[PDB]
Amino acid sequence: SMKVAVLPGDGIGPEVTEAALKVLRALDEAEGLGLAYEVFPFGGAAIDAFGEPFPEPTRKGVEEAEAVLLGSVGGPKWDGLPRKIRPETGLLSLRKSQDLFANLRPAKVFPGLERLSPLKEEIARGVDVLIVRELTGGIYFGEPRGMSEAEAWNTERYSKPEVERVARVAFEAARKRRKHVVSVDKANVLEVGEFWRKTVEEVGRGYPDVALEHQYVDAMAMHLVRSPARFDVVVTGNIFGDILSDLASVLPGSLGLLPSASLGRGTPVFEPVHGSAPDIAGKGIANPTAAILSAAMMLEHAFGLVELARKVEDAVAKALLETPPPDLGGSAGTEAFTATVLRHLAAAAL
Amino acid sequence: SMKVAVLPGDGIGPEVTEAALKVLRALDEAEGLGLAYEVFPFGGAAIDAFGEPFPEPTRKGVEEAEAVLLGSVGGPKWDGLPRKIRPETGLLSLRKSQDLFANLRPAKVFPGLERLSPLKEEIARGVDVLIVRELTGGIYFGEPRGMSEAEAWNTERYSKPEVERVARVAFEAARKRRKHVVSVDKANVLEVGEFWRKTVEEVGRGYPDVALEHQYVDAMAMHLVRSPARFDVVVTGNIFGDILSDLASVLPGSLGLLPSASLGRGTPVFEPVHGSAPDIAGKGIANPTAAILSAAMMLEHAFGLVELARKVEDAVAKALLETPPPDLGGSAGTEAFTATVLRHLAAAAL
Ligand SMILES: NC(=O)c1ccc[n+]([C@@H]2O[C@H](COP(=O)([O-])OP(=O)(O)OC[C@H]3O[C@@H](n4cnc5c(N)ncnc54)[C@H](O)[C@@H]3O)[C@@H](O)[C@H]2O)c1
Ligand SMILES: NC(=O)c1ccc[n+]([C@@H]2O[C@H](COP(=O)([O-])OP(=O)(O)OC[C@H]3O[C@@H](n4cnc5c(N)ncnc54)[C@H](O)[C@@H]3O)[C@@H](O)[C@H]2O)c1
Ligand SMILES: CC(C)[C@H](C(=O)O)[C@@H](O)C(=O)O
Ligand SMILES: CC(C)[C@H](C(=O)O)[C@@H](O)C(=O)O
Ligand SMILES: [K+]
Ligand SMILES: [K+]
Ligand SMILES: [K+]
Ligand SMILES: [K+]
Ligand SMILES: [Mn+2]
Ligand SMILES: [Mn+2]
């Protein structure tokens, strides 16, 4: 069995999630996976129907599933709502309630696809980075937070156990990869960066088989574009991970490519890094690669189906060469691009 | 009368500041500018002699000067000091004591120098971006702040007047440029981002001749590398401006290139974006472009010598064509590169 709660959300979310469901249904028919999914209202779609972005039946669906496949939430229609019911607060709540503290956001340039990057070929060649972002703490969830007429405030707060457990994930990921971690902070200005750095250094002592370096967040952002092949695992807190991972999209060449997994105590969540892209929603052009590769991360991390996840990545890469979507300089919209993916997947099987 | 307080600082700070001084001296001799400068201890060097990074004689010099030419502060020698007296806190105290709230950090790709970027030529071509970063508020200065054994906290916060005065600077800069402002925040997750967005939008109603757009900081980091030519003025808070301005160095191709001005109520300060670069300090290689162009920004913003600022910018461009430094793939050390800038300046003098 493979029990999946599907949260398509808003804007391009449903468009890309549908493309990802087509790939999963195809795998399920080919492989006998026992795929069982149900679609649940989430974000702005949930607000329009229930008045809150993460309503009861959706919380229940998440809770009872083995994995969540998520699209994206948000858009101009919901601009101005009180924060406690905004579409993005629904995704914060989902993460927090499942204690999904480890956000894995990989960025790789597939051999032969260096041409898709805005970076010169020789700079993009061989890039394979993994961002391990702390997802349930920091300024996203810190108290106090608020606003008056005169001012507004938010609190970047981390405890020792929160830093420890995300650091452990990064070192364990680096063990499985190329044995390098760079930890990222603003320790020269912020108490919380200092605390972060010391704690990651403490956890590092238990992994003498892994190399540990530290970088200030400003320099890291530069180094990640100028010398990306240098980095293996990058560990950082909630807001800096959010920023470095959208930035990491310029390595393979588009934010339409980047998948993610959110792992922790509860039901794991797999979603594109990208948002709901209201500028192109409803035009049938959204690149579904990030949703499709998030379904591949789900197969690997939630279901242990490592080889199927790899066939999906391979058919995506082929489709990227054959029929690029518009965000990568081609003209294949969502359904045509997914169709190319499905033909490569059928060619690899049938 | 051109009274300048010079704060060389630590690591490559004195190296590149000396080169900027050679350029200012050649201008003073050729133009009779009444240049009168004095060199003051600052950062780590001030800590070792006086016990604090912004000591009394340097405070007095800054106060009595019409402008500050500042190098860089910091390095492993001062790691572990109480925060109150860290080299970087000396730079925070300089900014705050002079109420320099507007940090101007420009990034341009000069025509014919696109090949210096790690981005493909067609992407770097025509780039001309000005980041206007709020410099005296936000998480850098927010209270409460602290660290125990169990946790650490910092407060990101902004008042209405602090947002307003930096937004006004951004719109007034846009009016002199291409009349486009993008304001950058994280309003979908942070109260402070929403307060920022609302306030910039309110200020923008006075400037309806300026297009105003808003981007979340993660999507902005991505857009700045993929589509840099689309941006004119970018306004943002303290930490986001820190990050995006290091990232902006990949457009012309090196952090060794980017100058900045800090403007407000008190004595304006001009310094490179880059740090003290302890990994190359004392090797005679540091690119002095950023310091030299910071002296140009000083001539423009503090002294109204716009024509002389442009001549310096033109001699720097030609030096980068003829004898690039090692951070840009060439072999000219700091002194050799400066000598090329001086040769071009002396030709322009004719
Ligand atoms: N996980 C999420 O639900 C998530 C993440 C980020 C943003 N958001 C929400 O998304 C909305 C848009 O915000 P944004 O513009 O900053 O982020 P965005 O990630 O939605 O879009 C960023 C840029 O990339 C383009 N883009 C993104 N995904 C793409 C795809 N698959 N194909 C082609 N182009 C793509 C968009 O058109 C836009 O130009 C906002 O409401 C934001 O709050 C949601
Ligand atoms: N304005 C300031 O005084 C300032 C700004 C940033 C960092 N710092 C401090 O500087 C020190 C180093 O921090 P960092 O490594 O993150 O930042 P950095 O900006 O000093 O160096 C970042 C990278 O760019 C290279 N680089 C920087 N300037 C260069 C130049 N002019 N020419 C050639 N290469 C150059 C460096 O060697 C290094 O690889 C720390 O003590 C940090 O706190 C100070
Ligand atoms: C929807 C929002 C909370 C989110 C985040 O900032 O985590 C978005 O950029 C993302 O990257 O998921
Ligand atoms: C010295 C430090 C406070 C500084 C900053 O973050 O402002 C550094 O990155 C810089 O960019 O000046
Ligand atoms: K998403
Ligand atoms: K479950
Ligand atoms: K500096
Ligand atoms: K003064
Ligand atoms: Mn994001
Ligand atoms: Mn910086």
Side-chain angles (χ1 to χ4, degrees), chain A residues 83 86 115 117-118 120 145 150-152 154 156 160 186-189 191-192 194 226 242 253 327, chain B residues 83 86 115 117-118 120 145 150 154 156-158 160 186-189 191-192 194 226 242 253 327:
Chain A
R83 190 161 296 282
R86 87 161 57 242
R115 218 201 312 92
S117 185
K120 289 159 171 171
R145 61 195 308 158
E151 66 189 333
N154 279 100
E156 162 93 323
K160 191 89 168 315
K186 191 76 181 186
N188 60 348
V189 173
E191 287 82 337
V192 67
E194 179 181 348
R226 182 109 200 258
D242 172 55
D327 47 297
Chain B
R83 195 159 289 276
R86 76 163 58 267
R115 63 164 154 69
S117 187
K120 295 168 167 161
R145 60 189 308 158
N154 281 102
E156 171 81 325
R157 60 188 283 189
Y158 270 115
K160 188 155 218 189
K186 190 77 186 189
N188 56 353
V189 163
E191 293 76 337
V192 184
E194 175 181 352
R226 266 206 108 172
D242 180 42
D327 46 303

Side-chain angles (χ1 to χ4, degrees), chain A residues 215-285:
Chain A
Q215 284 291 333
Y216 298 135
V217 68
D218 59 338
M220 180 63 203
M222 179 277 291
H223 288 306
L224 181 64
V225 174
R226 182 109 200 258
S227 318
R230 179 173 148 186
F231 298 110
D232 169 19
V233 174
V234 175
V235 67
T236 194
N238 215 323
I239 179 70
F240 296 162
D242 172 55
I243 292 163
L244 292 175
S245 51
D246 259 28
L247 179 54
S249 70
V250 309
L251 312 171
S254 165
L255 191 57
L257 301 170
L258 297 195
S260 77
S262 307
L263 301 189
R265 290 188 303 159
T267 309
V269 168
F270 301 86
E271 60 161 334
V273 172
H274 66 70
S276 71
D279 52 334
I280 63 168
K283 300 172 195 304
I285 64 175

Side-chain angles (χ1 to χ4, degrees), chain A residues 79 81 83 86 88-89 92 114-121 123 133 139-140 145-161 186-195 198 216-222 225-226 239-240 242-243 246-247 249-250 253-255 273 327-329, chain B residues 79 83 86 88-89 92 114-121 123 139-140 144-161 186-195 198 216-222 225-226 239-240 242-244 246-247 249-250 253-255 273 327-329:
Chain A
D79 282 357
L81 288 182
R83 190 161 296 282
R86 87 161 57 242
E88 296 81 6
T89 299
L92 299 188
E114 295 72 15
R115 218 201 312 92
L116 309 180
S117 185
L119 289 179
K120 289 159 171 171
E121 217 162 83
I123 303 181
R133 158 191 183 205
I139 198 175
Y140 275 42
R145 61 195 308 158
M147 88 182 267
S148 63
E149 274 204 80
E151 66 189 333
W153 54 93
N154 279 100
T155 297
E156 162 93 323
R157 180 189 306 283
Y158 265 111
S159 67
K160 191 89 168 315
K186 191 76 181 186
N188 60 348
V189 173
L190 298 180
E191 287 82 337
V192 67
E194 179 181 348
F195 183 84
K198 290 176 165 158
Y216 298 135
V217 68
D218 59 338
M220 180 63 203
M222 179 277 291
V225 174
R226 182 109 200 258
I239 179 70
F240 296 162
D242 172 55
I243 292 163
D246 259 28
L247 179 54
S249 70
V250 309
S254 165
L255 191 57
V273 172
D327 47 297
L328 290 160
Chain B
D79 281 350
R83 195 159 289 276
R86 76 163 58 267
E88 297 80 4
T89 290
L92 303 181
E114 294 83 3
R115 63 164 154 69
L116 298 185
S117 187
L119 295 173
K120 295 168 167 161
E121 277 165 35
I123 300 163
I139 198 163
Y140 281 44
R145 60 189 308 158
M147 181 175 169
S148 61
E149 280 172 46
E151 57 165 355
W153 56 95
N154 281 102
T155 301
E156 171 81 325
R157 60 188 283 189
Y158 270 115
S159 72
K160 188 155 218 189
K186 190 77 186 189
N188 56 353
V189 163
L190 296 184
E191 293 76 337
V192 184
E194 175 181 352
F195 179 88
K198 163 179 159 246
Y216 297 127
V217 63
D218 55 338
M220 186 60 217
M222 181 278 301
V225 175
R226 266 206 108 172
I239 184 63
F240 296 166
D242 180 42
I243 301 166
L244 296 169
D246 260 30
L247 176 54
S249 68
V250 311
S254 181
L255 189 51
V273 170
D327 46 303
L328 294 160

Side-chain angles (χ1 to χ4, degrees), chain B residues 1-290:
Chain B
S1 160
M2 189 178 298
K3 214 286 146 193
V4 183
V6 182
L7 277 50
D10 305 311
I12 71 167
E15 292 177 31
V16 306
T17 299
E18 175 60 35
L21 297 174
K22 294 193 214 316
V23 166
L24 291 154
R25 284 175 217 128
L27 290 173
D28 185 54
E29 283 152 63
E31 304 295 339
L33 300 178
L35 172 59
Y37 66 84
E38 191 170 326
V39 181
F40 291 97
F42 196 63
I47 294 158
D48 296 344
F50 287 98
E52 61 173 312
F54 186 36
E56 207 214 291
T58 304
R59 298 195 295 268
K60 194 186 156 183
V62 171
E63 276 294 310
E64 302 180 336
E66 295 171 299
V68 170
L69 183 64
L70 158 58
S72 290
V73 299
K77 193 189 183 207
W78 303 281
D79 281 350
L81 277 176
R83 195 159 289 276
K84 180 177 170 186
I85 58 154
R86 76 163 58 267
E88 297 80 4
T89 290
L91 182 47
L92 303 181
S93 310
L94 171 59
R95 290 158 179 181
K96 190 78 162 168
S97 59
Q98 299 300 319
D99 201 22
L100 308 178
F101 59 90
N103 192 216
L104 271 48
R105 290 177 170 204
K108 306 175 49 148
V109 176
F110 263 80
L113 286 176
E114 294 83 3
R115 63 164 154 69
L116 298 185
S117 187
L119 295 173
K120 295 168 167 161
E121 277 165 35
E122 63 267 19
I123 300 163
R125 180 179 308 105
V127 166
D128 182 348
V129 58
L130 172 69
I131 295 175
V132 175
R133 159 194 181 201
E134 201 290 323
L135 200 59
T136 51
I139 198 163
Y140 281 44
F141 285 95
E143 293 287 346
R145 60 189 308 158
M147 181 175 169
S148 61
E149 280 172 46
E151 57 165 355
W153 56 95
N154 281 102
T155 301
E156 171 81 325
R157 60 188 283 189
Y158 270 115
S159 72
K160 188 155 218 189
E162 299 172 296
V163 187
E164 293 171 339
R165 58 184 185 175
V166 72
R168 278 187 244 121
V169 173
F171 290 99
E172 300 289 351
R175 276 203 171 146
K176 298 190 288 186
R177 294 171 51 88
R178 302 188 317 279
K179 293 196 161 58
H180 281 77
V181 169
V182 52
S183 169
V184 181
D185 60 45
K186 190 77 186 189
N188 56 353
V189 163
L190 296 184
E191 293 76 337
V192 184
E194 175 181 352
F195 179 88
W196 176 281
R197 182 171 299 214
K198 163 179 159 246
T199 307
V200 172
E201 184 76 42
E202 293 164 3
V203 176
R205 245 104 72 188
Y207 300 85
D209 59 315
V210 182
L212 170 68
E213 151 191 347
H214 303 283
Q215 288 290 338
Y216 297 127
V217 63
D218 55 338
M220 186 60 217
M222 181 278 301
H223 285 307
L224 178 58
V225 175
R226 266 206 108 172
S227 306
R230 166 181 192 78
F231 301 106
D232 175 17
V233 177
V234 181
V235 61
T236 193
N238 215 330
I239 184 63
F240 296 166
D242 180 42
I243 301 166
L244 296 169
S245 57
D246 260 30
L247 176 54
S249 68
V250 311
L251 311 175
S254 181
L255 189 51
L257 293 166
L258 294 190
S260 70
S262 303
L263 309 178
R265 306 201 310 202
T267 307
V269 171
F270 302 85
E271 55 159 336
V273 170
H274 69 63
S276 64
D279 56 334
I280 65 157
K283 304 176 155 56
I285 70 182
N287 181 352
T289 292

